[PDB]
Amino acid sequence: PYLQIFGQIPQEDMDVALMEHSNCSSEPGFWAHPPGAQAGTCVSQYANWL
Amino acid sequence: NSLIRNLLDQASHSVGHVLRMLLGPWSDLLLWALLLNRAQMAMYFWEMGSNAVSSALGACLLLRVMARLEPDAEEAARRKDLAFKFEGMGVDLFGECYRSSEVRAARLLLRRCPLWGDATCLQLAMQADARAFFAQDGVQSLLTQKWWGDMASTTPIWALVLAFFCPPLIYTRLITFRRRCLRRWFHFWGAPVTIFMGNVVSYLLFLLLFSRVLLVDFQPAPPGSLELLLYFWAFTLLCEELRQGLSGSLSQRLRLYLADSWNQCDLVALTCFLLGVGCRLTPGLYHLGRTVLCIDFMVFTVRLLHIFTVNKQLGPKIVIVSKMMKDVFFFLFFLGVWLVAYGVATEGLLRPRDSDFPSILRRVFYRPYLQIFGQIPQEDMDVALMEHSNCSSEPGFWAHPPGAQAGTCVSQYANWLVVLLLVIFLLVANILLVNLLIAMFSYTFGKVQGNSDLYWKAQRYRLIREFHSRPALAPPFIVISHLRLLLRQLCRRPRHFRVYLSKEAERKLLTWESVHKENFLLARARDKRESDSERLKRTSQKVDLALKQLGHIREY
Amino acid sequence: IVIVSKMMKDVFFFLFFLGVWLVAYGVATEGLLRPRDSDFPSILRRVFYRPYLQIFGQIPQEDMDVALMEHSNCSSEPGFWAHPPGAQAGTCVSQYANWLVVLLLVIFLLVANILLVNLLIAMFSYTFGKVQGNSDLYWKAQRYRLIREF
Amino acid sequence: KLLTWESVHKENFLLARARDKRESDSERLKRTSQKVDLALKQLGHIREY
Ligand SMILES: CC(C)CCC[C@@H](C)[C@H]1CC[C@H]2[C@@H]3CC=C4C[C@@H](O)CC[C@]4(C)[C@H]3CC[C@]12C
Ligand SMILES: CC(C)CCC[C@@H](C)[C@H]1CC[C@H]2[C@@H]3CC=C4C[C@@H](O)CC[C@]4(C)[C@H]3CC[C@]12C
Ligand SMILES: O=C(COc1cccc2ccccc12)Nc1cc(Cl)ccc1C(=O)O
Numbered sequence: 001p002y003l004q005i006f007g008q009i010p011q012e013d014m015d016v017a018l019m020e021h022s023n024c025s026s027e028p029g030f031w032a033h034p035p036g037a038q039a040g041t042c043v044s045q046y047a048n049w050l
Numbered sequence: 051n052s053l054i055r056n057l058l059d060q061a062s063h064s065v066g067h068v069l070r071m072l073l074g075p076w077s078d079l080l081l082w083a084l085l086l087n088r089a090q091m092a093m094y095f096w097e098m099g100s101n102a103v104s105s106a107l108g109a110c111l112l113l114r115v116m117a118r119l120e121p122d123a124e125e126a127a128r129r130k131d132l133a134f135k136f137e138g139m140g141v142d143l144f145g146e147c148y149r150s151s152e153v154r155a156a157r158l159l160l161r162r163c164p165l166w167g168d169a170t171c172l173q174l175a176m177q178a179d180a181r182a183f184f185a186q187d188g189v190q191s192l193l194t195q196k197w198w199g200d201m202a203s204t205t206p207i208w209a210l211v212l213a214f215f216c217p218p219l220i221y222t223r224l225i226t227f228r229r230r231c232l233r234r235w236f237h238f239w240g241a242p243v244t245i246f247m248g249n250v251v252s253y254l255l256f257l258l259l260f261s262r263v264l265l266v267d268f269q270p271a272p273p274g275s276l277e278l279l280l281y282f283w284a285f286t287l288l289c290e291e292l293r294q295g296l297s298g299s300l301s302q303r304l305r306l307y308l309a310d311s312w313n314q315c316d317l318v319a320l321t322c323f324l325l326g327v328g329c330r331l332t333p334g335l336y337h338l339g340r341t342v343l344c345i346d347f348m349v350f351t352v353r354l355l356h357i358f359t360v361n362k363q364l365g366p367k368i369v370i371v372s373k374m375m376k377d378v379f380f381f382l383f384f385l386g387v388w389l390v391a392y393g394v395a396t397e398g399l400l401r402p403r404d405s406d407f408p409s410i411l412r413r414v415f416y417r418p419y420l421q422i423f424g425q426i427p428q429e430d431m432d433v434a435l436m437e438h439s440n441c442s443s444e445p446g447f448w449a450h451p452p453g454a455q456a457g458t459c460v461s462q463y464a465n466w467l468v469v470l471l472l473v474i475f476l477l478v479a480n481i482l483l484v485n486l487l488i489a490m491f492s493y494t495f496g497k498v499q500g501n502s503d504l505y506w507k508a509q510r511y512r513l514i515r516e517f518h519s520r521p522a523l524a525p526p527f528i529v530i531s532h533l534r535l536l537l538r539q540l541c542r543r544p545r546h547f548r549v550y551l552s553k554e555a556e557r558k559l560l561t562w563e564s565v566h567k568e569n570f571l572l573a574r575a576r577d578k579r580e581s582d583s584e585r586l587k588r589t590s591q592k593v594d595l596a597l598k599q600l601g602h603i604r605e606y
Numbered sequence: 607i608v609i610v611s612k613m614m615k616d617v618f619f620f621l622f623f624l625g626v627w628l629v630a631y632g633v634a635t636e637g638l639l640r641p642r643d644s645d646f647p648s649i650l651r652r653v654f655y656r657p658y659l660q661i662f663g664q665i666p667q668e669d670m671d672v673a674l675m676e677h678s679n680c681s682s683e684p685g686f687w688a689h690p691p692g693a694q695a696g697t698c699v700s701q702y703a704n705w706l707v708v709l710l711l712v713i714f715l716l717v718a719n720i721l722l723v724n725l726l727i728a729m730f731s732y733t734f735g736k737v738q739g740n741s742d743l744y745w746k747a748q749r750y751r752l753i754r755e756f
Numbered sequence: 757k758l759l760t761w762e763s764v765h766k767e768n769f770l771l772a773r774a775r776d777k778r779e780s781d782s783e784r785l786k787r788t789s790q791k792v793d794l795a796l797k798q799l800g801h802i803r804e805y
Contacts (some may be wrong), residue, residue: 006480014541037076038434044727264637266644270683330786337685337702344637345706345764351630355623371725378721416708423719424663447753455673488724495728506679599799606805 402457
């Protein structure tokens with residue numbers, strides 16, 4: 001988020017629309033594993049609009 | 051001693067023309083006190099002397115150039131605030147004659163004085179650096195009218211440019227003025243504003259043509275028609291620059307022409323173009339010729355910027371931008387030191403195996419410089435975004451990066467410290483630097499606008515003068531005007547405003563300005579008699595006089 | 607509202623300066639580097655559009671620096687070309703003076719993103735400080751006019 | 757009613773301004789100068805004594 005100030009905005013890592021949907025976790029939810037290296041191997045998307 | 055007898059002995063044993071003319075009526079005692087720096091004597095001599103304009107103006111020329119020739123601080127200072135107050139009460143002397151008779155003041159300006167050497171008040175002002183005189187609204191209006199000479203100085207700009215584009219439009223209901231042919235034609239084509247418009251159109255056409263030749267038609271092949279006509283245009287431009295340097299005593303003219311740094315950049319631009327043409331014509335230096343022509347486009351275009359300055363809504367601010375250069379120097383120095391620091395720190399922490407001199411020089415300055423403008427190689431610097439490998443034989447983790455010039459084989463041992471240093475760099479440079487810079491820009495801009503405007507008045511005046519001196523024709527066709535003026539020098543081998551004023555109209559104007567000047571004397575006479583401090587003084591010498599009178603009758 | 611209406615002279619000022627400086631730098635760049643796609647629309651794009659986005663973080667460094675491109679003989683004219691990976695930056699760029707190319711790019715970034723914008727910032731600050739009271743009184747008048755129509 | 761009201765208020769305003777230029781410092785210097793040179797004149801009228 002500090003790089004977020006200076007134009008380094010990981011939009012493709014943060015927005016559900018830009019990441020491909022997959023069942024990367026066993027928890028009953030929608031995840032859509034992002035392609036970022038240190039953005040987490042399996043993130044959630046329940047309130048990604050928020 | 052001082053500046054009187056030493057200079058008089060110098061003249062006897064021997065602006066400089068004035069000293070030669072003088073040797074050992076109201077004008078005579080006037081100049082005597084001005085050389086002798088008798089302040090009160092001098093103001094009295096002037097006030098009860100003739101040609102009050104013109105003469106406070108000549109005396110202020112002498113005062114200013116004298117304070118410039120004065121080796122003593124005190125006489126320079128007293129001489130210069132004498133110049134200040136003389137010029138001030140002269141400019142409102144001119145204002146009171148101006149608000150009384152517009153045309154009479156106008157014809158007061160362009161009057162020939164048998165005084166200090168036949169320099170019109172405008173020349174007196176420029177040589178005296180009378181920026182206050184120039185900024186005076188009356189002379190501002192007169193110079194505006196001259197810049198629009200015979201061109202209906204109140205005419206709209208759009209009508210004028212449409213008239214320039216449509217020569218038949220000159221004979222219409224629009225664009226009024228002051229063989230109606232030929233004469234109207236010459237007045238229009240010789241008006242300084244039309245000269246400026248034509249010059250701007252010509253410069254724009256030249257820059258378009260030169261860009262077109264550079265971009266599409268600059269093959270290694272021998273130059274074509276476009277390039278040849280470009281060379282011809284540039285030869286015309288070189289000719290006009292050298293001829294205006296030679297026109298506006300050949301050595302003296304050259305030396306004064308080395309001044310006016312605008313002219314200096316124009317000359318360096320043309321010298322660059324000559325070298326570019328030489329490199330182009332020689333087969334070997336073709337790529338070098340291309341590069342030098344490209345960098346020459348820079349100086350042409352930046353010269354156009356100073357060419358366009360005359361605009362009233364633009365000129366003061368263009369003068370402004372010329373005062374930020376020290377600020378950008380400061381911020382440049384500080385960015386440079388902080389930048390070279392951070393870069394050396396980065397290539398010290400991380401060890402690329404591409405330790406080449408050009409690669410290191412790139413990586414240490416160029417990339418971190420782009421890190422300010424959003425080009426941050428995060429995926430090239432952080433260990434968490436990049437893949438690990440056994441790249442180098444040196445013991446330690448290396449993790450070859452995916453970058454092209456970030457070094458083929460980086461080190462990651464203290465990459466956490468590398469990340470922290472990157473955070474510190476982003477905190478300092480992207481936040482502190484530019485922001486303190488824009489704050490001090492705001493300060494320096496708020497402290498310089500007024501003297502930029504008053505300077506712009508005189509700058510615009512100088513531009514109008516030189517453009518009035520410029521030949522009528524346009525740079526594309528300025529070959530005809532060059533053959534004319536060369537013939538004006540070549541048909542001389544076998545062979546600035548100056549509006550005349552009438553006799554006894556000289557007496558009318560002098561008395562009129564004499565009447566007005568004595569009215570201004572008596573007006574500031576009431577002003578000082580009613581001033582609060584002087585009225586307190588007056589009450590003092592009416593009450594001390596009263597007490598003296600009581601003392602005279604005290605014996606009663 | 608009156609202030610943002612009055613700032614129009616200042617925005618004109620910045621527009622003219624930006625335009626002259628961008629056309630300068632764009633022509634210099636298209637001269638110093640020689641794509642083989644010298645079409646009229648392509649040149650028109652590359653000379654104004656891209657250098658305009660150069661001010662807002664859209665830097666085609668991978669399209670203009672020799673250190674980030676791959677070298678190939680994409681043109682018959684003698685000299686190294688190193689075809690770029692871009693889409694409209696030309697199919698075959700020239701690299702003869704790419705060091706000077708980088709230097710001129712640095713000069714552009716220094717002049718544009720520092721000098722012009724920040725001087726314009728000061729220009730707005732000044733013109734906002736000098737006309738706010740007149741804007742308020744004119745707003746009183748204009749509000750009266752507006753309620754008159756309503 | 758409104759005419760006389762605004763006229764009364766206007767004459768109070770004229771009297772307020774008349775007195776305001778009767779304690780203003782510049783006009784007080786003016787009136788003090790008038791008093792002092794009137795004193796000079798009247799002392800002149802008794803100088804013959
Ligand atoms: C005020 C002017 C001089 C600024 C410079 C702008 C120049 C560089 C721009 C404006 C229009 C552009 C032209 C647009 C179309 C063409 C036709 C093509 O077949 C050759 C290139 C050429 C001629 C372009 C060259 C660059 C160009 C001429
Ligand atoms: C903050 C300011 C000073 C940044 C300056 C950036 C300069 C130093 C950068 C930008 C491009 C870089 C150049 C890129 C190409 C070359 C050509 C090579 O044959 C010598 C190194 C040299 C010349 C590099 C040296 C460093 C360099 C000139
Ligand atoms: O043209 C200039 C200055 O031009 C430049 C200055 C600094 C760097 C430059 C780099 C490239 C091109 C031009 C540059 N004119 C003036 C400068 C001052 Cl201080 C006063 C009067 C004038 C004037 O023209 O009257």
